[PDB]
Amino acid sequence: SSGRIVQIIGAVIDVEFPRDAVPSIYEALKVQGVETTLEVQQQLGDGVVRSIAMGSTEGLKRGLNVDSTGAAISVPVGKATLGRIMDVLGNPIDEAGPIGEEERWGIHREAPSYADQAGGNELLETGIKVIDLVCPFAKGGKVGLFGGAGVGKTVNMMELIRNIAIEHSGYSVFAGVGERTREGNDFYHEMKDSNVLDKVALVYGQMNEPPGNRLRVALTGLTMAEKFRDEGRDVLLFIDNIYRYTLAGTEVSALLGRMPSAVGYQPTLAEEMGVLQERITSTKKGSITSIQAVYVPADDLTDPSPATTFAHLDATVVLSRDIASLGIYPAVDPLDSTSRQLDPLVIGQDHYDTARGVQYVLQRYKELKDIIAILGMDELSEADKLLVARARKIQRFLSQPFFVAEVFTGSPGKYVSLKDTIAGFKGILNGDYDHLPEQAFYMVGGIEEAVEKAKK
């Protein structure tokens, strides 16, 4: 049947239904004669349900008719979502017409069971040397991305979007949780110009939308990724900012009147994070790997939001303003960036020793640079001077030309395998390329390309 609005207080709307037709928790409701969708949050009793509006409540009044849809917010899924921009409800926000959908899925579901987990800790080959060496990503894993603006965050996301589709037959989904409308338009044109737009589905929840939209956009993008995973694919789920997902939950919890927890967060903080993060896993059919940008409140890593998020992350990629100033791109910090997969029981002793060898040389070089800047280069030993020469070659060999960066680098893009990455750094650590100049390793790809560049 149909219900009536009984109370309106900001974004919170109470609707009364007949006793035999009360809608379920999380069900999507439609206001008659107005394009307003309501999600049911609680059943108050007496046939009354409390709901949150998925848009502006201006112009609504008590007594308007409301219709139940019979299911949760159901969004379009599959191939038709690629190269399109959509809102939280799955509507096409771009002026490109209706989505050619064949199926629709509800945004709320249980995480895959204990018996559905895939097996061993298989790696995801990104084709990027510094990441595949120092920050190995596992299939079905969660990666935290740290750093400021203007350090290559967008270019790094576009390179990952191109490589998963062309080298692994996968797809990508981008969830703009609290997206800035200016940056959302700029990113859409940058992906069209870089020819990666047809390999990704765009879901945006803009900052000016009510708290309920910003909280559910992550589940809409995740529902599209779950359809691609079920086709037997390996998928990339990009979350614009995981801190804004936490804040949207705090805002909704305060609107519903719940008693606040430590530091003012919602009492459901760990459960809301677990419901989202537990769906991102590797299963018997396929996998969803996620790259999530992380914001740290007041620079305090012990704050409930960062602390609750770090329990789900498998790797940490840190972008450095200092590395970008030297002309190296990507600006990953090989010393601050880390991975739970960087273990000899997971990646094997050869990859582990090569990566730890590179970190040892770069760490000691950072210490030698401070001595050179105070006492002078003449105070270092002959062995230290040789280490400085190897460290500079390793440091430049971490650089790589990207297919989406050809406009900036003026060089053709490169994809480097894990085998080629380990072999190249192992050779420089052992001294097999000590006779080559430091400029031969900069922006070349595999180790054979450095050997050929040195002859020009």
């Binding site: 800035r180 940056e183 409140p297």
Partner: protein
């Protein structure tokens, strides 16, 4: 915190700089414009790059101002350009 996260950039004014005679108290070290040179005329964009380097250098060499006698000519040089640009 809310408004810093909504805006495209921030101009931070500081009480310590304002009391030290630096009247338009803009802290260039933390202030940012995510649009950047796209919002600048050709002449200003060209001359602005050198100005930023000087102000950064002076920030990394301010303490050595009360002991300039014992500095390399080149470090002494960077400092004097920083003090004038500021």
């Amino acid at each position: 915190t809310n408004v810093i996260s909504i805006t495209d950039g921030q101009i931070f004014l500081e009480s310590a700089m304002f009391n030290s005679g630096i009247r338009p108290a803009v802290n260039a070290g933390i202030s940012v414009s995510r649009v950047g040179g796209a919002a600048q005329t050709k002449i200003i964009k060209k001359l602005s790059g050198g100005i930023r380097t000087a102000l950064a250098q002076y920030r990394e060499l301010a303490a050595f101002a009360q002991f300039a006698s014992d500095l390399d000519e080149a470090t002494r040089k960077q400092l004097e350009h920083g003090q004038r640009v500021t």
